[PDB]
């Protein structure tokens, strides 16, 4: 019978309800009172990377954090030299649409996902000049809307088809499919210890998954829209979410529930994207205003303004060092700050 | 340095090459398809393409013009996160089953029309499946006045276009629908985007070119809002 | 948790008075565009009505542009639907299709098959 199960299973997030409830005994807003906040940063743009054609609407950064792939909405994947503002491998793509790219984390590999139900896998260190293809990961029924590379072989893949995926680039079938949400899924991270990864979708309710175990560990609803961002805390043990409600909210992991609301009254337009400069003490919440907000996660107040696009924010991502922020935008140029 | 010199005369080669690829991209006018699984959204592509893959890249050159006309098949019924990939086009064509009732597709255009994104995409309308909507309210089993009743007070304009042999019930029908989406239409974006209300079968050879003289159209009214003319 | 109990259905005569209520927790009620969206059997989901943050902007679909009519309480984190009188062919559940994004006055996917934020669903019978 489906009213009762639907019933027990009403009872039981009720049940998840009082025992978040009953962790809570002081909120993170409560208890980080005495520590000073880092003040009105002036942070401004270093570079300007333009020479994408249309709205660029997902980036990675890399480990050597020097390298950035960055996936616009023409049909070109660029990878930026961003200490000299160089595009290396701006390479043709089977589908005009790419929503994603990831960046590997050693730098062979990206990741070229988009409306086209493909994850297409392109190395960049190869023999050939050519970012020619591995593999088409395909086998989604939904876009491609995140991706993070787990190793050179292994890649997570976020898909609007309420299913993530943990896929085997040397095989190109899917390793394991991580099906518990709801809603079309947008947003991925991978955690400091890789196993363990986060993901965002439309149902106001980012799940933190296996990679190993291969399906959910957690789930938060914290959310009351549509969750574009998502990424961890530098240590694998929070997450921060960002989605159309204007009001970015910090999670962590071994609690089940909200740490912080980020929302100025002012805020009457959703987040896109999230990241995080090696510190929980500065996040980075790019908004539907056309300019990024930086919140302090300790303190929820707004600690920065970045206004240097025409158009949305679209992907914000930090370095793996902590040294640059660049924030891709729909004005087809990326803007990095310091 | 000199790799540093060699990088960037490498990456002035990268943009020689997204120059070279912007030609055929600023050239090219984007066309986002769109219907409710129900209206001529799939014949459109078979006939004018002879003039697991969620994206179908269909190629038309129309009057030594290149258009890409984007067909979402293979894609979940959620549309709020991936049409949001469509506001660069230069145009989505939402194509209505105009005898199929069509206020599934009325709200579907209200969210198209409406969006924070596409409200500086205008919308080029396709009324499609004229030829099922003459055979629907010519033989009066299915009444549009019990799924509108407004389309009990409305009357035909006197702007209206009515075919060579076409019966007054079938342009008054037709023009009826036309004047739902147009209530949306001229609700929100009055200026700012445009919408473009024609008529379509699964027999006209002429939807290129309504497709051309409709996106031109469209760019003018863009290029008018770059001098703030319009 | 965007959680959406409607309230209401069950047996009545075609023509009866059926207000629909819908408890809304776990957003910000007023800051929301809300929907109503039927599912018949044999059918798929069909959307009945839209409005808006406040009351101004009002839309029906024309099978109960006449007979139907909505209101909305901010303070109360409540939808309602005030049904005056019933025809055969809507016997359905009415599904409280939440609006996907907030101060925007576009609503998408509120009559998709597999959409997050609606109800339980409450089958009006008549």
């Known amino acids: 019978e489906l009213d009762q199960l639907r019933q027990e299973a009403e009872q039981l997030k009720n049940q998840i309800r009082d025992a978040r409830k009953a962790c809570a005994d002081a909120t993170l807003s409560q208890i980080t009172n005495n520590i000073d906040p880092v003040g009105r940063i002036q942070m401004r743009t270093r570079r300007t990377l333009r020479g994408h054609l249309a709205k660029i609407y997902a980036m990675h950064w890399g480990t050597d954090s020097r390298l950035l792939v960055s996936a616009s909405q023409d049909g070109k994947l660029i990878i930026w030299d961003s200490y000299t503002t160089n595009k290396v491998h701006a390479i043709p793509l089977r589908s005009s649409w790419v929503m994603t790219c990831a960046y590997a984390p050693s730098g062979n590999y990206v990741a070229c996902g988009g409306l086209d139900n493909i994850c297409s896998i392109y190395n960049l260190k190869t023999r050939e000049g050519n970012v020619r293809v591995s593999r088409e990961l395909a086998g989604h029924t939904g876009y491609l809307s995140c991706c993070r590379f787990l190793d050179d072989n292994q890649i997570v893949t976020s898909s609007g088809d309420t299913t993530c995926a943990l896929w085997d680039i040397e095989t190109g079938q899917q390793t394991t499919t991580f099906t518990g949400h709801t809603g079309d899924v947008m947003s991925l991270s991978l955690a400091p210890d890789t196993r363990l990864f986060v993901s965002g979708a439309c149902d106001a309710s980012a799940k933190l998954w296996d990679v190993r175990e291969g399906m959910c560990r957690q789930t938060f609803t914290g959310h009351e829209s549509d969750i574009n961002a998502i990424c961890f805390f530098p240590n694998g043990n929070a997450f921060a979410t960002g989605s159309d409600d204007a009001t970015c909210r910090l999670f962590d992991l071994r609690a089940d529930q909200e740490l912080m609301t980020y929302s100025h009254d002012n805020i009457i337009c959703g987040i896109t994207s999230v990241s995080f400069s090696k510190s929980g003490r500065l996040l980075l919440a790019g908004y539907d205003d056309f300019n990024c907000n930086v919140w302090d996660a300790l303190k929820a107040d707004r600690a920065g303004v970045l206004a240097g696009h025409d158009n949305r924010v679209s992907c914000l991502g930090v370095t793996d060092d902590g040294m640059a922020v660049a924030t891709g935008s729909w004005d087809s140029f990326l803007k990095i700050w310091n | 340095s000199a790799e540093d010199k060699a990088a960037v005369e490498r990456s002035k080669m990268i943009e020689k090459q997204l120059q070279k690829d912007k030609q055929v991209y600023r050239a090219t006018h984007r066309l986002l398809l769109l219907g409710a699984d129900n209206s001529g959204k799939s014949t459109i592509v078979k006939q004018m393409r002879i003039y697991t893959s969620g994206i179908f890249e269909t190629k038309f050159q129309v009057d030594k013009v290149n258009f890409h006309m984007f067909d979402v098949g293979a894609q979940r019924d959620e549309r709020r996160k991936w049409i949001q990939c469509f506001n660069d086009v230069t145009a989505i064509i939402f194509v209505v089953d105009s005898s199929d009732y069509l206020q599934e597709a009325l709200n579907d255009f209200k969210s198209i029309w409406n969006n924070r994104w596409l409200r500086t995409i205008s919308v080029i309308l396709f009324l499609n499946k004229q030829d099922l909507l003459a055979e629907k309210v010519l033989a009066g089993k299915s009444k549009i006045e019990d799924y509108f009743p407004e389309f009990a007070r409305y009357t035909t304009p006197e702007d209206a276009t009515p075919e060579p042999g076409e019966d007054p019930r079938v342009t008054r029908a037709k023009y009826f629908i036309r004047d739902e989406f147009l209530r949306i239409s001229t609700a929100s974006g009055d200026g700012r985007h445009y919408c473009y209300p024609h008529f379509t079968c699964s027999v006209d050879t002429e939807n290129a070119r309504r497709i051309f003289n409709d996106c031109r159209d469209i760019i003018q009214r863009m290029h008018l809002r770059q001098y703030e003319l319009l | 948790q965007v959680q959406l109990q409607e309230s209401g259905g069950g047996l009545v005569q075609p023509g009866g008075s059926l207000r629909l209520s819908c408890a809304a927790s776990?957003?910000?009620?007023?800051?929301?565009?809300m929907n109503w969206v039927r599912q018949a059997p044999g059918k798929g989901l069909e959307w009945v009505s839209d409005?808006?943050?406040?009351?101004?902007?009002?839309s029906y679909t024309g099978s109960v542009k006449g007979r139907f009519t909505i209101s909305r309480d901010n303070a109360k984190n409540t939808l309602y639907l005030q049904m005056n009188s019933l025809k055969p062919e809507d016997t359905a559940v009415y599904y409280c299709?939440?609006?996907?994004?907030?101060?925007?006055?576009?609503?998408?996917?509120?009559?998709?098959?597999?959409?997050?934020?609606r109800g339980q669903g409450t089958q009006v019978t008549v």
């Open positions: 299709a939440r609006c996907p994004a907030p101060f925007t006055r576009d609503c998408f996917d509120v009559t998709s098959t597999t959409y997050a934020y």
């Open positions: 776990g957003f910000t009620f007023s800051n929301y565009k």
């Open positions: 409005i808006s943050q406040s009351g101004a902007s009002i």
